[PDB]
Amino acid sequence: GSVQIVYKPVDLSKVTSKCGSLGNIHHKPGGGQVEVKSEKLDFKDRVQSKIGSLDNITHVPGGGNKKIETHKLTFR
Amino acid sequence: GSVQIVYKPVDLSKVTSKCGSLGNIHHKPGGGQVEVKSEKLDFKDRVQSKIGSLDNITHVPGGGNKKIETHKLTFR
Amino acid sequence: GSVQIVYKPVDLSKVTSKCGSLGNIHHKPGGGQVEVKSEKLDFKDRVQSKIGSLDNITHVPGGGNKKIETHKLTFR
Amino acid sequence: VQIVYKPVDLSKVTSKCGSLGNIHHKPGGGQVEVKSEKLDFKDRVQSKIGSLDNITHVPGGGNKKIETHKLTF
Amino acid sequence: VQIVYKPVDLSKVTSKCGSLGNIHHKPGGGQVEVKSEKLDFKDRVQSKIGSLDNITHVPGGGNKKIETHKLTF
Amino acid sequence: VQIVYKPVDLSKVTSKCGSLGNIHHKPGGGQVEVKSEKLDFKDRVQSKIGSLDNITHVPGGGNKKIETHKLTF
């Protein structure tokens, strides 16, 4: 006996958008008042400490169209 | 016996966008008032400390259209 | 007995952005007071400290696409 | 004796007045037709035929902010 | 003796007035027809045929904020 | 004796007035037709045919901000 494999995926797909306009987009976070009082701040392994700080992302793609296609074949 | 592998993936796909306009995009974070009091700040392994800081990203591609196509084959 | 691999993927895909008149864009964080008071600051292994800092990364990539492939083939 | 005077003002005072933040999508689009042998206008006539108009007036929308922070020992 | 004087103001004072935050979607769209032998307008006539109009006035919409923070020892 | 004085102002006083933030997607379309054998306009006539207009007036929109900070020992 002999072993034969014929891997022929065929893709003709479309992933599309026809947006007419993306208008006036605004992102305006405000931090307020944050206060911390102690004798010690004492951080000893892999600590993320994040006092009154802002992390901000604005992400406006004219099309965000994402195609991911993973193929595997394995023989043992 | 014998072993034969034929590997002919085909992609003809379209990943597209036809945006008419990206308009007035505003990103204006405001930090507020932040205060920390102590006798010690004492940080000892892999610590991130992030006090009143602003980290900001603005990302406006006329298209963010993304194709990822990964192939693998393995024989043992 | 014999082993053969015939690896020949075909990619005829297109990733395309067609768009507009783009991007009055305004980026402009900050303004706020940050205060830290201590007798000691003591940072000793892999510490990242940010106090009152700004990070302002800005992209306007357009007419853009992203395309990635990987093709690993292993015989053993 | 100690005095520790430290007000914090994070307030916002805002006027948002007139024609703001609207969406208008394909205004018009249909046929407007006037058929005549004559149009004849002879004193102070305003005629609008098939026109689109966004006329906006704002005499208003002012702000005043006043503060005093007097400290006397 | 110690005095700590630490007001925090987080307030927003806002006037939103006029034509705000609307959606108008395919206004018009249909046929308008006027048929005559004559249109004849002779004094102070306002005539609108098939027109769209978003006229807006705001003489108002002001804000005033006043504060005093007097401390006397 | 000690005195410490340190007001923080992070306020904003703001006017947004007239026409702002509006989308106006594809205004005007279809047809306008004004078939006549004559048009005759002869005193103070305003005639608009098939036009678009965004005329905006803002004699308002002002701001005033006052503070005083008198510390007296």
Side-chain angles (χ1 to χ4, degrees):
Chain A
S2 298
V3 186
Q4 172 182 345
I5 300 183
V6 181
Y7 196 104
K8 299 180 177 182
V10 191
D11 189 346
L12 304 94
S13 58
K14 305 179 187 173
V15 186
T16 75
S17 63
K18 302 190 181 182
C19 177
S21 180
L22 296 187
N24 303 16
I25 291 150
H26 294 265
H27 185 191
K28 309 181 185 174
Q33 200 266 336
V34 182
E35 183 169 333
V36 180
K37 269 166 174 159
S38 67
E39 300 187 335
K40 296 205 292 168
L41 271 66
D42 185 339
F43 301 162
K44 285 193 171 74
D45 182 2
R46 282 168 289 169
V47 179
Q48 303 186 10
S49 180
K50 194 171 189 180
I51 302 178
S53 51
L54 318 183
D55 289 358
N56 319 282
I57 307 182
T58 299
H59 183 188
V60 186
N65 302 297
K66 179 174 175 179
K67 184 185 171 184
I68 302 185
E69 184 179 337
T70 283
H71 290 276
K72 188 178 296 185
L73 172 61
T74 290
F75 196 110
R76 305 191 182 207
Chain B
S2 294
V3 186
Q4 171 181 349
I5 300 189
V6 174
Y7 190 103
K8 307 185 186 184
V10 192
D11 195 356
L12 300 99
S13 62
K14 307 185 187 180
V15 183
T16 82
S17 66
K18 300 189 177 184
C19 180
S21 179
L22 296 179
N24 300 11
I25 293 147
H26 295 264
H27 183 192
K28 308 183 185 177
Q33 195 268 341
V34 184
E35 187 166 336
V36 183
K37 268 163 173 162
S38 65
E39 300 188 348
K40 297 206 293 170
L41 270 62
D42 186 342
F43 303 163
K44 281 190 167 79
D45 180 4
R46 281 168 289 173
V47 179
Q48 298 186 17
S49 179
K50 191 171 185 183
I51 304 178
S53 60
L54 315 187
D55 288 352
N56 319 276
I57 309 187
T58 301
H59 186 183
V60 186
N65 299 304
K66 179 170 177 174
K67 180 182 169 183
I68 303 188
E69 184 183 346
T70 281
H71 289 273
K72 187 173 295 185
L73 169 57
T74 294
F75 196 110
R76 301 194 180 208
Chain C
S2 300
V3 178
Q4 75 172 348
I5 297 97
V6 185
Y7 187 104
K8 55 182 180 182
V10 181
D11 191 354
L12 310 191
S13 310
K14 61 183 176 181
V15 187
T16 80
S17 300
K18 282 186 177 188
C19 54
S21 182
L22 300 179
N24 303 293
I25 301 179
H26 299 71
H27 185 279
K28 296 195 289 188
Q33 291 79 9
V34 183
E35 180 170 336
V36 179
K37 187 174 181 180
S38 193
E39 304 198 334
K40 190 179 300 185
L41 310 187
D42 185 352
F43 305 159
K44 95 193 297 183
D45 185 2
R46 281 165 285 179
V47 182
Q48 178 180 44
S49 180
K50 293 190 181 184
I51 305 176
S53 63
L54 319 181
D55 185 344
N56 291 75
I57 179 163
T58 296
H59 299 73
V60 187
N65 312 283
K66 297 183 64 175
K67 167 80 169 193
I68 293 98
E69 306 176 54
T70 71
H71 283 262
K72 186 171 182 175
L73 195 182
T74 299
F75 184 82
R76 303 192 179 210
Chain D
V1 175
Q2 78 175 349
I3 298 95
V4 187
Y5 189 101
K6 54 183 179 183
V8 180
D9 193 352
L10 312 195
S11 311
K12 65 179 178 179
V13 184
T14 87
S15 292
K16 282 188 176 182
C17 48
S19 183
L20 310 188
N22 304 287
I23 302 183
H24 305 72
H25 191 284
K26 289 185 283 186
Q31 296 80 9
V32 179
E33 179 171 336
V34 178
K35 186 172 179 179
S36 193
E37 308 198 333
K38 189 178 298 183
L39 312 190
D40 183 0
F41 305 160
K42 64 178 289 180
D43 185 358
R44 278 167 287 181
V45 179
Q46 181 181 48
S47 181
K48 295 189 183 182
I49 306 175
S51 60
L52 326 185
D53 186 342
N54 289 80
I55 181 162
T56 294
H57 298 72
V58 183
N63 312 289
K64 298 182 63 174
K65 170 75 170 190
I66 293 99
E67 308 173 57
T68 72
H69 289 263
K70 186 173 181 175
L71 193 180
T72 297
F73 185 75
Chain E
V1 174
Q2 72 177 344
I3 296 94
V4 181
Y5 183 101
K6 57 180 181 181
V8 179
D9 194 353
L10 307 192
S11 310
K12 63 181 178 180
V13 180
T14 77
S15 292
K16 273 189 174 188
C17 50
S19 183
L20 300 178
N22 301 288
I23 301 181
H24 301 71
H25 191 288
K26 299 189 291 189
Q31 294 69 44
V32 179
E33 178 169 343
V34 178
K35 186 176 179 181
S36 193
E37 300 196 332
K38 192 180 301 185
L39 307 188
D40 183 350
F41 300 159
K42 90 197 298 183
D43 187 358
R44 275 165 285 187
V45 180
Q46 181 180 53
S47 181
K48 294 187 185 183
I49 302 173
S51 59
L52 313 183
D53 184 345
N54 287 79
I55 182 159
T56 296
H57 298 72
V58 186
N63 313 283
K64 298 178 62 175
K65 175 69 171 185
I66 296 99
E67 307 172 51
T68 70
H69 286 267
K70 187 174 180 177
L71 193 181
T72 304
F73 184 80
Chain F
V1 177
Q2 78 176 357
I3 295 95
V4 174
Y5 182 108
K6 49 188 182 180
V8 172
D9 181 10
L10 291 179
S11 316
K12 62 184 181 184
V13 180
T14 60
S15 309
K16 288 168 185 168
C17 44
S19 179
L20 306 165
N22 303 308
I23 288 188
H24 295 90
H25 188 278
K26 298 202 296 182
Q31 299 190 350
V32 182
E33 176 163 334
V34 187
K35 188 172 184 174
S36 192
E37 192 173 308
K38 186 168 293 188
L39 303 180
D40 190 5
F41 306 156
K42 70 182 292 177
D43 185 7
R44 280 164 288 178
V45 182
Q46 174 182 128
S47 181
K48 294 190 177 183
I49 300 175
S51 62
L52 305 180
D53 196 343
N54 294 88
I55 181 168
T56 295
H57 299 74
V58 187
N63 290 288
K64 296 185 64 171
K65 160 73 180 191
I66 294 96
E67 301 184 52
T68 71
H69 279 269
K70 187 171 182 175
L71 201 184
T72 298
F73 188 79

